[PDB]
Amino acid sequence: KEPVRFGWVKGVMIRCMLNIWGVILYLRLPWITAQAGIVLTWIIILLSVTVTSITGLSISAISTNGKVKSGGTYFLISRSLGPELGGSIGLIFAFANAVGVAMHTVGFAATVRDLLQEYGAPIVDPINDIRIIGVVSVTVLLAISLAGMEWESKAQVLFFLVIMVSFANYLVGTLIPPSEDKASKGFFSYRADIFVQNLVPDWRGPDGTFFGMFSIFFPSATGILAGANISGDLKDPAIAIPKGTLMAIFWTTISYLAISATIGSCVVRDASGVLNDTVTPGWGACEGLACSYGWNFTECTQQHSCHYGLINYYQTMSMVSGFAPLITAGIFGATLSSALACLVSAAKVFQCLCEDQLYPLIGFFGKGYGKNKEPVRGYLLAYAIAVAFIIIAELNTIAPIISNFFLCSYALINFSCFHASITNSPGWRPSFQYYNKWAALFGAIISVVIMFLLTWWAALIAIGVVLFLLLYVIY
Amino acid sequence: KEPVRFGWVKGVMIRCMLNIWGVILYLRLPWITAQAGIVLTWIIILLSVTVTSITGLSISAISTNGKVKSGGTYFLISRSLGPELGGSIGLIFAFANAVGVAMHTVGFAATVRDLLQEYGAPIVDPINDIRIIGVVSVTVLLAISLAGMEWESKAQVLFFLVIMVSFANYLVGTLIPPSEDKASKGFFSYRADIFVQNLVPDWRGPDGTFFGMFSIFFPSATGILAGANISGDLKDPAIAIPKGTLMAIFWTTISYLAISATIGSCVVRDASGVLNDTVTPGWGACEGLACSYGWNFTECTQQHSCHYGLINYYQTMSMVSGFAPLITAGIFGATLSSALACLVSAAKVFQCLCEDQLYPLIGFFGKGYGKNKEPVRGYLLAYAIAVAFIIIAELNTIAPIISNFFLCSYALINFSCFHASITNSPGWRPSFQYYNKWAALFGAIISVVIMFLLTWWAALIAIGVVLFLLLYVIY
Numbered sequence: 001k002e003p004v005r006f007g008w009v010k011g012v013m014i015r016c017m018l019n020i021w022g023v024i025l026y027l028r029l030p031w032i033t034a035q036a037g038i039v040l041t042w043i044i045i046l047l048s049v050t051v052t053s054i055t056g057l058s059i060s061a062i063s064t065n066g067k068v069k070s071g072g073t074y075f076l077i078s079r080s081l082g083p084e085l086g087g088s089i090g091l092i093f094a095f096a097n098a099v100g101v102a103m104h105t106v107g108f109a110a111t112v113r114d115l116l117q118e119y120g121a122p123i124v125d126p127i128n129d130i131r132i133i134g135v136v137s138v139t140v141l142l143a144i145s146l147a148g149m150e151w152e153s154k155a156q157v158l159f160f161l162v163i164m165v166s167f168a169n170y171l172v173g174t175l176i177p178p179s180e181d182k183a184s185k186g187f188f189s190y191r192a193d194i195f196v197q198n199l200v201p202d203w204r205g206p207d208g209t210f211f212g213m214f215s216i217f218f219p220s221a222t223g224i225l226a227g228a229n230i231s232g233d234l235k236d237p238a239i240a241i242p243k244g245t246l247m248a249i250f251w252t253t254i255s256y257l258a259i260s261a262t263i264g265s266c267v268v269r270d271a272s273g274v275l276n277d278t279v280t281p282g283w284g285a286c287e288g289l290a291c292s293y294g295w296n297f298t299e300c301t302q303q304h305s306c307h308y309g310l311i312n313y314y315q316t317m318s319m320v321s322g323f324a325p326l327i328t329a330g331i332f333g334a335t336l337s338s339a340l341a342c343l344v345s346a347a348k349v350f351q352c353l354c355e356d357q358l359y360p361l362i363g364f365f366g367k368g369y370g371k372n373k374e375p376v377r378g379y380l381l382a383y384a385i386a387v388a389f390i391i392i393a394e395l396n397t398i399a400p401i402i403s404n405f406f407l408c409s410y411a412l413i414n415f416s417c418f419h420a421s422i423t424n425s426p427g428w429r430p431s432f433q434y435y436n437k438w439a440a441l442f443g444a445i446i447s448v449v450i451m452f453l454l455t456w457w458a459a460l461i462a463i464g465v466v467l468f469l470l471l472y473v474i475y
Numbered sequence: 476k477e478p479v480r481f482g483w484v485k486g487v488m489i490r491c492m493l494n495i496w497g498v499i500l501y502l503r504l505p506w507i508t509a510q511a512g513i514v515l516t517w518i519i520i521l522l523s524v525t526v527t528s529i530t531g532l533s534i535s536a537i538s539t540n541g542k543v544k545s546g547g548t549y550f551l552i553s554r555s556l557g558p559e560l561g562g563s564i565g566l567i568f569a570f571a572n573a574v575g576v577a578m579h580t581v582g583f584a585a586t587v588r589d590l591l592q593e594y595g596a597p598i599v600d601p602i603n604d605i606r607i608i609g610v611v612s613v614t615v616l617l618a619i620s621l622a623g624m625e626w627e628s629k630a631q632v633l634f635f636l637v638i639m640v641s642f643a644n645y646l647v648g649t650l651i652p653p654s655e656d657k658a659s660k661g662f663f664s665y666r667a668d669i670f671v672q673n674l675v676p677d678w679r680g681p682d683g684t685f686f687g688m689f690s691i692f693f694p695s696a697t698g699i700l701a702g703a704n705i706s707g708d709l710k711d712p713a714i715a716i717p718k719g720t721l722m723a724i725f726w727t728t729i730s731y732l733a734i735s736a737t738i739g740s741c742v743v744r745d746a747s748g749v750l751n752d753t754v755t756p757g758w759g760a761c762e763g764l765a766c767s768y769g770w771n772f773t774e775c776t777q778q779h780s781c782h783y784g785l786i787n788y789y790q791t792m793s794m795v796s797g798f799a800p801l802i803t804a805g806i807f808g809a810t811l812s813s814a815l816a817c818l819v820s821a822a823k824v825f826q827c828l829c830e831d832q833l834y835p836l837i838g839f840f841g842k843g844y845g846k847n848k849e850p851v852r853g854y855l856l857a858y859a860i861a862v863a864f865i866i867i868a869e870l871n872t873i874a875p876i877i878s879n880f881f882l883c884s885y886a887l888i889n890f891s892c893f894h895a896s897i898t899n900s901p902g903w904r905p906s907f908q909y910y911n912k913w914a915a916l917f918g919a920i921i922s923v924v925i926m927f928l929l930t931w932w933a934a935l936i937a938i939g940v941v942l943f944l945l946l947y948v949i950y
């Protein structure tokens with residue numbers, strides 16, 4: 001029986017777009033669009049998708065150089081800078097993936113717990129919900145993954161249709177004239193005054209600065225390596241990976257631009273929330289843009305003490321939409337698909353590191369054969385780390401370290417491309433047309449600069465871990 | 476004719492103590508002792524002189540391994556981690572020395588300009604005073620250095636006696652009962668109440684925190700390599716360098732502890748300055764410690780608006796002293812001696828890098844023979860950089876970069892000692908008794924941690940410069 005192989009749409013493009021898409025799309029992008037305005041948010045997005053376009057070009061060059069197995073992303077790092085950065089970066093990559101599984105299952109569990117506690121169902125413990133639900137969910141994802149690749153592919157296609165149905169729901173909701181409830185919370189239909197009033201920044205709070213918004217958005221634009229991790233299950237990786245990866249980046253960026261632009265021209269940044277604030281005839285004068293529409297939000301602006309509008313309410317996108325539960329369905333499909341992509345990615349890197357003869361550090365892990373064409377001893381190792389970090393259940397302080405474990409790989413992939421091309425290395429002869437040494441060098445430099453600019457002590461911890469592994473292997 | 480050779484007192488100990496001693500001894504240590512109290516200042520000092528004791532032990536181990544020439548400090552880095560970190564760290568070291576010459580000549584020129592502008596107006600303009608005086612002074616130092624080693628040694632001994640005369644002046648001044656003028660500014664003789672009241676911190680201002688005081692004091696404790704840079708002009712380096720370097724560190728630390736402890740038990744932290752604040756009979760009550768001595772400084776504490784006392788006035792040490800001009804003479808001898816040590820150090824590293832066959836980057840600099848047993852083409856290269864940075868004349872923003880250029884050398888010296896000892900390197904067999912691998916490893920780690928903890932972007936710039944040199948040499 002032949003194995004199962006996938007095309008460039010269902011194998012590379014869908015997976016990459018599903019891993020890039022998360023919950024910043026639903027719960028933070030409308031707030032970033034309010035703090036920083038439309039134009040400066042577009043600058044944020046287009047600056048973030050340059051570091052990932054350059055790395056996508058390096059990946060597309062690596063893919064058109066020969067046949068690699070699934071999870072051999074670090075083979076170029078190994079054969080260009082020695083096999084002790086190969087295995088060390090491989091292990092760091094495959095550990096960051098298995099922690100991202102936990103950090104997404106926790107995000108799904110929190111949404112389910114919040115949805116549950118409103119409907120009734122007296123829960124057990126207000127924080128053991130996020131543990132029981134997380135463990136059950138990660139076990140169901142493990143079963144799906146361990147039942148084969150076809151079932152994982154079908155689950156991913158299901159998630160893709162759910163996300164698109166949420167998008168169409170939102171886009172239909174924005175074209176429907178406001179009702180009393182939505183106009184009382186800020187949503188007015190497409191208006192020209194709101195587009196102009198909302199192009200320029202309005203920073204508020206202790207975190208509202210351009211660096212803060214870059215810190216919120218940038219880590220949620222990466223994920224472009226989900227289709228290159230399974231480069232051994234595709235029908236022709238040398239054509240499937242460049243096209244799929246680059247169109248994934250392109251269409252994800254178009255969605256990010258369209259959502260911010262259309263949300264920024266419909267909802268004002270301050271609104272009261274109660275229907276008893278329509279304009280009174282004879283009430284002297286009122287200050288504010290919405291006064292021309294029949295609503296009076298002066299008390300908010302005077303006191304800074306209300307909870308609705310584009311800048312104060314994190315769930316504006318659910319309010320604008322025609323029917324609200326489809327946005328929650330979109331959130332489910334956005335978190336579970338990223339968790340599934342990370343679980344499949346961390347398994348095929350562990351399974352390659354366990355079979356790597358030149359990096360024998362963890363080659364001892366396998367006892368049973370598991371000869372069913374599945375990385376069983378790489379699925380169980382990722383499941384253990386995911387469950388261990390789901391038990392802890394509060395991961396907002398471990399996040400910078402894990403997020404720098406991923407930029408340590410971007411920097412070394414780009415620098416290995418540059419180093420092998422300038423040195424005329426014996427066997428590195430890519431054929432991708434749009435690849436250049438100096439773009440790769442720029443990507444390698446800018447990834448380290450961003451690593452330290454985000455949080456310097458987390459970068460020091462990441463580099464210390466990589467160095468400890470590298471030096472424990474040399475000695 | 477034989478060359479001139481020096482003993483361990485006039486060759487290693489005096490030079491190291493004169494390079495460690497600067498102006499923090501005179502103008503900032505009494506202020507650090509006031510912000511942080513006596514005990515926490517002692518902790519500052521003893522934490523700073525651990526990173527330098529460990530590096531002194533590594534240096535003393537390198538020195539008892541064989542005969543090195545003058546300026547071959549980076550030879551162990553070259554033969555343990557390859558000759559492209561050897562030359563790169565050597566060049567960075569010898570450039571930081573030549574910029575330290577400028578940063579000390581500017582400090583001397585500022586003192587001379589301030590002393591001049593008070594006595595009359597024989598000044599061009601502070602702006603260009605600090606340039607004309609700086610250039611003339613650095614040229615006089617260049618002449619002294621270029622006239623031989625004996626004259627430089629005599630100048631250093633002169634500076635040492637001037638500093639000791641300043642110390643004895645201050646110590647005699649603190650034992651003399653206060654007069655009206657000194658008591659009106661805060662100086663009371665050795666009192667027991669003041670010792671107790673002034674042991675615990677009192678942080679004020681936007682910079683008054685333990686990290687801030689570490690940042691002020693730590694860079695002014697290094698300079699321990701001034702006697703190992705001329706290890707080719709000593710009578711027996713293998714005995715002279717360990718003993719001289721370690722006793723230099725010991726006696727400098729004893730002076731740092733004694734000055735802070737004795738200044739902290741004589742002067743209160745707030746005092747008005749005018750003689751019209753003695754205690755009035757019938758003036759109700761007064762708040763403050765000095766009220767028991769006959770002085771009334773309540774208005775300061777109420778308004779925070781006076782300019783004298785240990786915490787507000789930077790020149791307390793000149794006020795306490797019996798005769799004040801000897802403190803200014805001590806400041807001259809402290810800045811000019813450090814500038815002279817840095818000028819001799821940067822010349823003998825440039826001259827070794829110009830004659831280094833395995834690092835040919837700047838081996839082209841020499842045209843004339845200059846066969847007079849002096850590094851003429853290393854003196855002129857250091858003179859050029861010193862003059863170039865004295866013309867700029869405002870160097871408070873370049874300081875962190877230059878100060879991290881010096882911790883990049885500490886880290887690599889310590890790590891090269893550890894790496895050569897664990898690897899059983901063929902030819903690294905030191906005989907210094909008090910040397911251990913793990914102390915060197917700790918020093919190498921803590922130097923990088925301190926590099927980034929002081930200022931992270933300056934550390935990134937320093938590491939980027941080192942990497943650019945290292946990679947330009949490989950390609």
Ligand SMILES: CN1[C@@H](CSCC(F)(F)F)Nc2cc(Cl)c(S(N)(=O)=O)cc2S1(=O)=O
Nearest residue numbers: 100219222223225226342345399402403406
């Ligand atoms: C959304 N993710 C961010 C990390 S932000 C959350 C944090 F982990 F930082 F806490 N970066 C990447 C990068 C890659 Cl390359 C891959 S993947 N599957 O290609 O290997 C997956 C991810 S992610 O899904 O974890």
Ligand SMILES: CN1[C@@H](CSCC(F)(F)F)Nc2cc(Cl)c(S(N)(=O)=O)cc2S1(=O)=O
Nearest residue numbers: 575694697698700701817820874877878881
């Ligand atoms: C007081 N100095 C501080 C630097 S603080 C001022 C700054 F440069 F940072 F701006 N560190 C060192 C270290 C060494 Cl090792 C040597 S030396 N002569 O042994 O090579 C000289 C010096 S220093 O005299 O420049």
Ligand code: NA
Nearest residue numbers: 018021334338
């Ligand atoms: Na997703």
Ligand code: NA
Nearest residue numbers: 493496809813
């Ligand atoms: Na000095």
